[PDB]
Ligand binder design. Structure first.
Ligand SMILES: O=c1[nH]c(=O)n([C@@H]2O[C@H](CO)[C@@H](O)[C@@](O)(CO)[C@H]2O)cc1F
Ligand SMILES: O=c1[nH]c(=O)n([C@@H]2O[C@H](CO)[C@@H](O)[C@@](O)(CO)[C@H]2O)cc1F
Lengths: 807, 807
């Protein structure tokens, strides 16, 4: 049907059809008379999987022959979403399968909707890991993703009476056709025990053993025949009154049961520590095994790179020391040199409550040897500090891996910097902030460790897969090469005054909005005007992300309409979506506020269809693929200095939404790439936030001087939005007024004014679209292919390659 | 190679080879260079499974079109063992696969050894269920096996320092290629709650829901293209702080976690009650669903038969009442008529400690509605009793489903008799004992309910599969028809004086012994003389089975050798094997005694290779398939009146061992079929046991009069067999002397004398073999095909059919 979706040759369609029928019969044990749509999805999924395996086996064979340096990406999160369409895209089978299933009388799109998301992540950091695997395969790097096969991923979000309810995400219920269990590669992991010192060094004894069983999932590169591996570990009890003993096997296996649903918040629970060691201990054994099948660990850093996605797998550092010192009998100094040269660390936040600071008594019980290695690391590190800054006793306590206080803690971030040859932030402004503030001391010691690697997104999932209409009209004009070289989108700048392109871009957006508006009614009974501006804020719910600022704007628009009902306003559909961590009370209250606003606004006859406020339930990867292409306005409104990067922002820019936001995270590089005139920037810069802090933030001041703001607060306090419980929102008002760490009021005036400028541009469709073209055309930098190429060259020491492997 | 194993046509071998290669590549994702023997087993298993599915789909289709009466076999145990070879046998693919794997350079037999047993049973009762499924498919009955998919089956038995150690049987670790998950057919099961009475009858409310997910395993008939279904239910939690809530899902799912390892012993644990209801509640919903897709439940008993394998699924009775009365709104009397006509009950023991007597307080909490239905059943039943035996108040309390006492209990056996149209024992003597003793009262009320159905074994697994050599020499002479008409073995009587046959029978036995002797050294480092008589007792360890009597004989032989070292004795290898329930202390002590005897006997240089005592570790189905063909003497020595049937006995008769035993269980019918002269019968009959009881059993008497017995006891008491702990066996001696319920001493003299007659026959190879021929030739009655044909005609009301379905 459309050209980017590949060829539907007669040989391929015929081959796919009979393989579909084979799997339905032999694999699913069904016939056409009893098969449900779910059986058809599986038959298609198995048929597509068949095309992967040949390439998968040869890719692993190739890496064995050639023996290149291997990249190990360690993450506790891999937010993969669905695999079927993505696999088709990267294999050029999309049209072929469309044809083949059409001829069998089935609608492929309907079948795609049946696949469960692999929601093995929380948000940005987990999805970054997913985009990265895609890009690594597309760039032909010998790269492995390592993590945990959670039985339950991020919870499904249900709204009941406007409240979030969490229900277990049981994504393996019907099975996962993509994974291959590899029980033969099972590995022991140790916990508890004690440390013995012998003549021949320390020994870790009396441990409890948990077995780690790997599952391999294929990661196909874009049309290059490269298929890399994602290896996820599952917890299994060893085989050594009776009934209870068997039932107690669940204790060991609980390790891989459930993903912790905190985003940007540290919770010091033991089960989470067990998860962190489990992935690290099994992964490192696997790495060393593969290394030995190529005595001399000098070459280890030439053959191995290990990337740490945040501090979650930071125990890789003392674990590698443990293995090298205790088991391989290398001397400390040589083992340490190997470790530093092998490991690299990526930071994703500067919020102090997000930093992992493990109580020493936990590490002592669970990992007594690792605590000893950490104390030894800390001591030798502090000796370097003392030697470089003699007499500076305060530097010593600031830089320590060990924090003193009520309870002693290990600062895992300090550990990562000391034990890594490179430390990076995830956007330029974030990388600068790390150097100026929380890691200043470390930067002064070792300036050469600190780098920037601005985040990116994969244009395969985030353009071709979710927005074929837009990919097609672009391909019509500039070809297909841009899909793996997103810089080529610049060529689109010479179409900015082209009447045909302007009409096509706008037509694609209209189609996406129509389709999404239909999806809203069919799956969630909600009535929206598709001619309105689609104003969307989707991301995890957090105070720093300031969904509350958005709420205040929405209430302002409503109050303005009610004040002058017969005045013309640009109509809007305001969509806010995202999950709150189950114990984050404030986040839960914000979700409730949003729905309460919708209850009032959406049922006011005076408002008409001019303003609708929708909360998007169960925001997740597959919902993102639908709403992002349909958006006109992307809300990226974090208080300056708090959002490390953002990647949602990039998804919107790539798909033809304009951005309203602060000079925060990657926003800064986006505006810089598109031109500030092509972006809606408002609010305090980082420096303004600092000035406000030194002086003191007094929210009363804004309440006293802005009548429109005062009215909103009075409405909140008095029960306008909660008529049956007048004081339902006292916590929110109280926080806004007395302890807002994120200065919602300080940005309010500028935000509202900037929002008027957006509405004005929207009234002029042609100029709106011309600005969109200028965004799409400069989004090339934000490809994860660029990001990974920089990781590869400046951290890992490997050259990317665009070259095909033989078919 | 051998004719009973089918054709190895060139088309088939070629087809099998490429399908093997297909599965290795696409299903296992391996190539010939990285594949282990385990990968090869799986590739073969998937290849064979492919031949089943076509037939499986058409068999289920056929039953839909024709709509015959359906048999539902409800059991908590299905002791299946391995599936690969059995599937090959029943499909006539054995030689073809042998050829095909040989050409790929693999040894099929080596690959077969890799398959884990499905040990979803304890012993006799579980294996009966397995033989039955085979026979039902072979007889073309529309029959379904229903049970529980235990995650862990019967424990693996390890011997350490001569003690039993139990380790978890993790049989699903590497996956099970035979099962098909059917998550789409998932069904809710209810527990706890309370009962509400409305205008419109009783309602069961506030229940906890556990989901039952079915797994279907194919059951192929013998060369008839019939493939029936075994459906095993798995426990799943429904999808509705947070972390703990998810971890607590294990509580619900523990229902199908582990098989209770008691044999002939009731343990009143709640988890076991949950298992019993779980299988019954999900199974009945499935039955009724299938019935409705053919309002009028009059026809229900014409379309449904439900067989209860012991009292374990007895809750089917009040559950069917519950569904019919509470949900379908039939009146009591009509529902009851339907229930009785639908249900039938098989008893497997008369030992009072084996009978299920559930505490009322358990049923009250867990199943409050079922308790009400039971009280109502009991009341109306006792009204029939009162009306038939007016004034007999003691009959009323004896026959009650409710037992009075310290704690009130439900007698589940009384429930089954009242709610079933037929009740059967499992051998003629056992069926008579039920009528004369424990169920006398019930027999006098309803004589027409009581039947006999003597047990059988399947000649497919128990001759063709495990003893191809013997099946072949038989086929040479009488053809192949006997495999599904085992009565034809009679034709072998005219070969009893045939010199060629005599030599062939004996040659096959010698080969089996050689092969098993090799297996002993290769897998368990033990040195045995293959010219010795193989004296084997394999079965669960239990006092009534009298492994202890066997021990006393063994010690006697040893004491006789030591007394006259230079006198000739027929050499023996004495093999005893079987698992003890983990909490059955006495059973555990008997295992220890056996090994201790081996420690003394096997290392005495005076004994030479004349007497060896081996304990066979981890006795299970696949070990039975090896040891049974190698046996010369089958030990079946239970105290008369205690062993309901036995089926091990039948396995030995079929495979050319002679039997030493008591007139107990099926032994009686075996001797009657072969002629008493062709059998080694000894000891008290049932009547003698009764006489001894009335008078009183005084073991001291035998100790005072039998010097050889006195010496053995003195050896036990004084530490001859336990030199480091002289009093290790005080419990055993004490039991033998003061509270032996099974009268070991009373049978001792006769047992030893009968054992001398065995040795004498063994000295004359030709006459030994002629007697063997007379056993094999009369074992036809003991085919499970005969058993199931009698169940079908006299209980279920369906005609068996030997006719092929189209290929
Ligand atoms: O716990 C965390 N979880 C998480 O998803 N991020 C995110 O990591 C992303 C990837 O670097 C960034 O783009 C981000 O700025 C917005 O999601 C950042 O907040 C950062 C954390 F600290
Ligand atoms: O709990 C039990 N488990 C069990 O396996 N059987 C057996 O059920 C078999 C099948 O009917 C019989 O042959 C038997 O006599 C010897 O195993 C009998 O003991 C009887 C029980 F009661």
């Amino acid at each position: 049907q459309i050209s980017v979706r590949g060829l539907a040759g007669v040989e391929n369609v015929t081959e796919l059809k009979k393989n579909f029928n084979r799997h339905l019969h032999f694999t699913l044990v069904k016939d056409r008379n009893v098969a449900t749509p779910r059986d058809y999805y599986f038959a298609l999924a198995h048929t597509v999987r068949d095309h992967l395996v040949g390439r998968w086996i040869r890719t692993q064979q190739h890496y064995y022959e050639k023996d290149p340096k291997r990249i190990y990406y360690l993450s506790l999160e891999f937010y993969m979403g669905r695999t079927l369409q993505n696999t088709m895209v990267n294999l050029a089978l999309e049209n072929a399968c469309d044809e083949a299933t059409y001829q069998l009388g089935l609608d492929m799109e309907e079948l795609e909707e049946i696949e469960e998301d692999a929601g093995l992540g929380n948000g940005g950091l987990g999805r970054l890991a997913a985009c990265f695997l895609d890009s690594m395969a597309t760039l032909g790097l010998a790269a492995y993703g390592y993590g945990i096969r959670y039985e339950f991923g991020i919870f499904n979000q249900k709204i009941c009476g406007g409240w979030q309810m969490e229900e277990a995400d049981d994504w393996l219920r019907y099975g996962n056709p993509w994974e291959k269990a590899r029980p033969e590669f099972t590995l022991p992991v140790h916990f508890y025990g004690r440390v013995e010192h012998t003549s021949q060094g320390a020994k870790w004894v009396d441990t409890q053993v948990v077995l780690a069983m790997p599952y391999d999932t294929p990661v196909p590169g874009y049309r290059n025949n490269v298929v890399n591996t994602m290896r996820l570990w599952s917890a299994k009890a060893p085989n050594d009154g009776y009934i209870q003993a068997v039932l107690d096997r669940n204790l060991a296996e609980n390790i891989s049961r459930v993903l912790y649903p905190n985003d940007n918040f540290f919770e010091g629970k033991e089960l989470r520590l067990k998860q962190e060691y489990f992935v690290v201990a099994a992964t490192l054994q696997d790495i060393i095994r593969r290394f030995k099948s190529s005595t001399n660990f000098d070459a280890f850093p030439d053959k191995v790179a290990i990337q740490l996605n945040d501090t979650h797998p930071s125990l890789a550092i003392p674990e590698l020391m443990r293995v090298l010192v205790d088991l391989e009998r290398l001397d400390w100094d040589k083992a340490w040199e190997v470790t530093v040269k092998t490991c690299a660390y990526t930071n994703h936040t500067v919020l102090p409550e997000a930093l992992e600071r493990w109580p020493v008594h936990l590490l002592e019980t669970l990992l007594p040897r690792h605590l000893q290695i950490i104390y030894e690391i800390n001591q030798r590190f502090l000796n370097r500090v003392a030697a470089a800054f003699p007499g500076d006793v305060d530097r010593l306590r600031r830089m320590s891996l060990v924090e003193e206080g009520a309870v002693k803690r290990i600062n895992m971030a300090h550990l990562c910097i000391a034990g890594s040859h490179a430390v990076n932030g995830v956007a330029r402004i974030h990388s600068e902030i790390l150097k100026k503030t929380i890691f200043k001391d470390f930067y002064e010691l070792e300036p050469h460790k600190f780098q920037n690697k601005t985040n990116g997104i994969t244009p395969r999932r985030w353009l071709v897969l979710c927005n074929p209409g837009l990919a097609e009209i672009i391909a019509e004009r500039i070809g297909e090469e841009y899909i793996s070289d997103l810089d080529q989108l610049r060529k689109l700048l010479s179409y900015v005054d082209d009447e045909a392109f302007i009409r096509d871009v706008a037509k694609v957006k209209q189609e996406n909005k129509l389709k999404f508006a239909a999806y809203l009614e069919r799956e969630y009974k909600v009535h929206i005007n598709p001619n309105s501006l689609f104003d969307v804020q989707v991301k995890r719910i957090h105070e720093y992300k300031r969904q509350l600022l958005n709420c205040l704007h929405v209430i302002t628009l409503y109050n303005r309409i009610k004040k002058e009902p017969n005045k013309f306003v640009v109509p809007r559909t305001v969509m806010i979506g995202g999950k709150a961590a189950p114990g984050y009370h404030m986040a839960k209250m914000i979700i409730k506020l949003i729905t309460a606003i919708g209850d009032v606004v959406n049922h006011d006859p005076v408002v008409g269809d001019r303003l609708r406020v929708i909360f998007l339930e169960n925001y997740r990867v597959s919902l993102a693929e639908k709403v992002i292409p349909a958006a006109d306005l992307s809300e990226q409104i974090s208080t300056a200095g708090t959002e490390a990067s953002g990647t949602g922002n990039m998804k919107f820019m790539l798909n033809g939404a304009l951005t309203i936001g602060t000079m925060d995270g990657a926003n800064v590089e986006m505006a810089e790439e598109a031109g500030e005139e092509n972006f809606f920037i408002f609010g305090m810069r980082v420096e303004d936030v600092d000035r406000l802090d030194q002086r003191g933030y007094n929210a009363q001041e804004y309440y006293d001087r802005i009548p429109e703001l005062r009215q909103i607060i009075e409405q909140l306090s008095s029960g306008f939005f909660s008529p049956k419980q007048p004081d339902l929102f006292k916590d929110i008002v109280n926080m806004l007024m007395h302890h807002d760490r994120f200065k919602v009021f300080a940005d309010y005036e500028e935000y509202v004014k900037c929002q008027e400028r957006v509405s004005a541009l929207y009234k002029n469709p042609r100029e709106w679209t011309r600005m969109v073209i200028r965004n799409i055309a400069t989004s090339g930098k934000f490809s994860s292919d660029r990001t990974i190429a920089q990781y590869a060259r400046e951290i890992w020491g490997v050259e990317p390659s665009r070259q095909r492997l033989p078919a």
